């Protein structure tokens, strides 16, 4: 009644730390890989269900820019000031 | 440069049965790969790849709110039949 | 005379003339000028390419060799100089000559001979002026095996006798090559079986040059250093080629180590900000 | 239309519908040796159409990772019809040559080759401490290829492209008779090389007058289902071929 | 081949390999004001190459649902180099302009734009009971766009395409200096507009001499995996620029 290793999610690595067997109800959160940020509102985690079955999960990571560049002359305006999801095409204002 | 030889370093044209034949077969030159680039605290790698060979590079990017300390990129150097990154990855100060 | 092209005054344009558009595939280098892609003013250009002449470029004395020879016969020190003439041991001049495949010219050879007295505790002397002898030995001539060899008789071989203090000895020589032009590069062999020597040394043979002190002997050990200088004149060059990129390793071949095409930089868009008020 | 062109030498004829003019050596066109420049007193032989014709060499495949190729003449034509026979039986030779490199693809493929003729292309060794072997310089109509990385061979040529195996910059090879084969505009490249040497004539086995190098500056690329086989064929025809010093054939 | 053309004004040059001739205003070509038609007694200034050059404006993206765009000059060039500086410091102005709209795709894309220059393109308001605001008529090099449906804005322009925001039929805009950009044959459009006005000169901030409209009659379309980004860039260069009434720069 123990789940094995979480499924494989593209561009994401599950935070095992650093177990092997996950008891039922065990909630594993996936972290997006470098150059990737979690798409807001999307499922980024799974859970060990009955039958040693992990919940379902799919790609939740889109390519994104690093946090905007820190400048001496200008500071970021809201909400960019606290954003981390900058998909290609994102335009920020200082 | 960037490839490691696998097999014989030479061959002789010896007499083989009814004719002259090369003593050793052609060797193999397999791509030298650098070790997985290092992940850095509060930063990512832009367009991270599967493998990295001679002269290929990896460019880092600090997350939002962090500042880059060091060169943006490193490069796979291949002295000497073993692959090695040019230097240490940049660092991200918050 | 060797003046540069002037810039014709050009005005607005709007036609089917496409001087800016071309195709490098043809192997043809665009002959466009500023007046073809913008409005220009008339400019009487008086600049001259007089110093870009192959003559003015190569006609400058450049060191090609240097050796040291002693006076006294102590230890295993050479008392005379020997040298298989060629300009492949001095990267500077060698790189210029190699800008072209073939060369033809006369040459002015100058020698800078200087002497000295080796260190010692008790070396009080009073040696008269040192006289030197430089002898050229074309391929085949008898070579001296000592500072007293009969070969130094210079019966027919050209030779120079110079005494220190006077102006450095000099003398001109014509176009020696047995070919119609000197060859800086020879992608061939010395033997028909495609083996033996490969390249320059396979055909070039300007002979040898020997030097020595005509003075019998010195109380205490002394040495002299002769520096040979070449200055081609009445120059002619053919087939230009890519300048040497990799450092020179051997003076007998073109061996080299994989060198970078050029220096590096941050990125293709990197340009240093030099304006910071 | 200057795109289409036709070449006729001997019993051979080449056709093109996508060429880019014709480069003529250093402005000169092949010509027989004049009396006021000759040295060999014996009357030379001029097979003409017998040796001055188009000889096609083994084709080569251009791949997304190809670094380049190179041939050495007249050596590479030692086994080509009567042109090779005269090389064996004669001590001295002299020829022009009309290099014609073919390579077609499609409006959907991309890449750019650099067809160049390098006179006296003296090359270096992989191991700077050793020498090179003729076998590694030129091997008949079989082409030697450049490598995107350093070589290690004992008596091999430093095939690393960036230095063209001469210790120079590849981007400067444009100073030699050349043409490019930009697939989006080209289809072939022709170069008429005149006899270039510091001597009226010379041996054709011992001396490699010039080297033909085909180095791609724009990697071959294409999409899926697009012909992956893109060959590069080289054709060359001697011009004003003269021979002197007739004797017993040379045993290769 | 009349397909290829080159334009040179000042230190700027435009190239084209797929154009369709050049429309020259109403048969006239830009010219300086003559003495028998001048009014301003002060000697005008003619920066020439300083202001008469190609100025590229912010590019625009053509989408399968794009309805059109429009710019107003000389207002749109108020912040363009020295041409804009002379507008500030002078009371009167006069210029020609060479409109050059670029837009390339591929033999697999399709669409047709209508590049037109409408003199005195007085436009109407969304709410027929109210008036329009300059801010909604022209906003610098930033283009205003037409909508496939009716607008509602308070002081906005009736962007509904079918009426071109003028209360007329779009199919009749061909009565103004124009050209089309039929991707299957074109690649750009050039129009040389001569100074058109009921006065020798006029203010360049208060008056919008003409409006450039780019309305697509053939919707942009293509198959899968075909570049979806098809930008439309507008470049314009003043001609025979004259200025009168020099005074303190105008605060925008
Ligand atoms: C009397 C001294 C004679 C010296 C002969 C020097 C000849 C130099 C020839 C250089 C050939 C070359 O650089 O390719």
From Swiss-Prot, chain A:
Disulfide bonds join 3-48, 32-61. GO terms for biological process: complement activation, classical pathway; innate immune response; negative regulation of complement activation; positive regulation of CD4-positive, alpha-beta T cell activation; positive regulation of CD4-positive, alpha-beta T cell proliferation; positive regulation of cytosolic calcium ion concentration; positive regulation of T cell cytokine production; regulation of complement activation. Residues 2-63 form the Sushi domain. The Ser/Thr-rich domain is heavily O-glycosylated. The keyword Disulfide bond applies. Keywords: Blood group antigen, Cell membrane, Complement pathway, Disease variant, Disulfide bond, Glycoprotein, GPI-anchor, Host cell receptor for virus entry, Host-virus interaction, Immunity, Innate immunity, Lipoprotein, Membrane, Receptor, Repeat, Secreted, Signal, Sushi. Expressed on the plasma membranes of all cell types that are in intimate contact with plasma complement proteins. It is also found on the surfaces of epithelial cells lining extracellular compartments, and variants of the molecule are present in body fluids and in extracellular matrix. Glycans are attached at residue 62. Changing residue 19 to L: In Tc(b) antigen. GO terms for molecular function: lipid binding; virus receptor activity. One of its GO terms (cellular component) is ficolin-1-rich granule membrane. This protein recognizes C4b and C3b fragments that condense with cell-surface hydroxyl or amino groups when nascent C4b and C3b are locally generated during C4 and c3 activation. Interaction of daf with cell-associated C4b and C3b polypeptides interferes with their ability to catalyze the conversion of C2 and factor B to enzymatically active C2a and Bb and thereby prevents the formation of C4b2a and C3bBb, the amplification convertases of the complement cascade. Belongs to the receptors of complement activation (RCA) family. Monomer (major form) and non-disulfide-linked, covalent homodimer (minor form). Interacts with ADGRE5. The first Sushi domain (SCR1) is not necessary for function. SCR2 and SCR4 provide the proper conformation for the active site on SCR3. It is linked to Complement hyperactivation, angiopathic thrombosis, and protein-losing enteropathy: An autosomal recessive disease characterized by abdominal pain and diarrhea, primary intestinal lymphangiectasia, edema due to hypoproteinemia, malabsorption, and less frequently, bowel inflammation, recurrent infections, and angiopathic thromboembolic disease. Patients' T lymphocytes show increased complement activation causing surface deposition of complement and the generation of soluble C5a. This is Complement decay-accelerating factor. It comes from Homo sapiens (Human). The lineage of its organism: Eukaryota, Metazoa, Chordata, Craniata, Vertebrata. The gene is CD55. The chain holds residues 34 to 127 of 381 of the full protein.
């Amino acid at each position: 009644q123990d789940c094995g290793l979480p499924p494989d999610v593209p561009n994401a690595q599950p935070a095992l730390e650093g177990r092997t067997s996950f008891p039922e109800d065990t909630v594993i959160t996936y972290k997006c890989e470098e150059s990737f940020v979690k798409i807001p509102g999307e499922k980024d985690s799974v859970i060990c269900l009955k039958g040693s079955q992990w919940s379902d999960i799919e790609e939740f990571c889109n390519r994104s820019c690093e946090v905007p560049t820190r400048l001496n002359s200008a500071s970021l305006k809201q909400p960019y000031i606290t954003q981390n999801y900058f998909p290609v095409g994102t335009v920020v204002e200082y | 440069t960037g490839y490691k030889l696998f097999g014989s370093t030479s061959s002789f044209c010896l007499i083989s049965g009814s004719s002259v034949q090369w003593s050793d077969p052609l060797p193999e030159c397999r791509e030298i790969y650098c070790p997985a680039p290092p992940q850095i605290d509060n930063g990512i790698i832009q367009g991270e790849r599967d493998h990295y060979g001679y002269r290929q590079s990896v460019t880092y990017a600090c997350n939002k709110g962090f500042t880059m300390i060091g060169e943006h990129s490193i490069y796979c150097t291949v002295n000497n039949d073993e692959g090695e990154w040019s230097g240490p990855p940049p660092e991200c100060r918050g | 005379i060797a003046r540069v092209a002037d810039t014709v005054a050009s005005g607005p344009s709007n036609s089917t003339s496409i001087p800016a558009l071309t195709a490098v595939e043809t192997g043809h280098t665009s002959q466009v000028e500023p007046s073809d892609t913008m409005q220009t003013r008339h400019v009487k250009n008086y600049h001259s390419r007089s110093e870009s002449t192959v003559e003015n470029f190569l006609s400058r004395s450049a060191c090609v060799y240097i050796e040291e020879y002693y006076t006294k016969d102590q230890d295993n020190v050479n008392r005379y100089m020997s040298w298989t003439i060629n300009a492949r041991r001095m990267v500077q001049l060698r790189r210029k000559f190699e800008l072209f495949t073939y060369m033809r010219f006369d040459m002015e050879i100058t020698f800078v001979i200087t002497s000295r007295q080796l260190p010692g505790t008790s070396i009080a002397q009073d040696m008269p002026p040192l006289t030197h002898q430089i002898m050229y030995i074309p391929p085949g001539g008898p070579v001296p095996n000592s500072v007293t060899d009969f070969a130094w008789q210079t019966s027919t071989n050209p030779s120079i006798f110079w005494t220190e203090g006077n102006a450095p000895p000099r003398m001109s020589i014509p176009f020696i090559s047995i070919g119609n032009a000197y060859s800086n590069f020879y992608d061939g062999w010395s033997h028909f079986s495609q083996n033996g020597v490969y390249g320059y040394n396979a055909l070039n043979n300007m002979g040898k040059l020997y030097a020595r002190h005509v003075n019998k002997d010195t109380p205490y050990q002394m040495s002299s250093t002769i520096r040979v200088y070449f200055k081609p004149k009445h120059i002619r060059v053919w087939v230009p080629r890519p300048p040497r990129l990799s450092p020179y390793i051997k003076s007998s071949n073109v061996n080299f180590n994989p060198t970078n095409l050029t220096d590096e930089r941050s990125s293709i868009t990197y340009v240093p900000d030099t304006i910071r008020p | 239309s200057d795109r289409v062109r036709s070449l006729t030498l001997g019993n051979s004829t080449i056709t093109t519908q996508e060429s880019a003019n014709v480069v003529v050596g250093y402005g000169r066109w092949p010509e027989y040796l004049r009396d006021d420049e000759a040295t060999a007193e014996d009357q030379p032989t001029q097979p003409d159409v017998a040796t001055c014709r188009f000889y096609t060499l083994e084709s080569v495949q251009w791949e997304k990772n190809s670094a380049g190729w190179w041939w050495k003449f007249p050596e590479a034509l030692k086994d080509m019809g009567l042109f090779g026979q005269n090389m064996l039986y004669h001590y001295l030779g002299r020829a022009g040559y009309t290099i014609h490199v073919q390579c077609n693809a499609s409006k959907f493929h991309q890449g750019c080759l650099l067809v160049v003729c390098v006179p006296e292309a003296e090359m270096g060794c992989s191991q700077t401490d050793k020498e090179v072997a003729a076998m590694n310089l030129t091997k008949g109509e079989a082409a030697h290829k450049f490598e995107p990385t350093k070589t290690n061979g004992e008596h091999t040529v430093q095939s690393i492209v960036c230095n063209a195996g001469m210790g120079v910059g590849v981007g400067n090879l444009t100073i030699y008779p050349h043409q490019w084969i930009n697939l989006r505009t080209n289809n072939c490249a022709t170069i008429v090389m005149p006899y270039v040497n510091s001597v009226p004539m010379d041996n054709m086995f011992r001396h490699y007058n010039f080297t033909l190098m085909v180095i791609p500056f724009a990697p071959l690329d294409y999409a899926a289902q697009a012909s992956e086989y893109v060959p590069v064929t080289v054709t060359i025809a001697p011009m004003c071929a003269e021979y002197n010093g007739l004797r017993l054939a040379y045993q290769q």
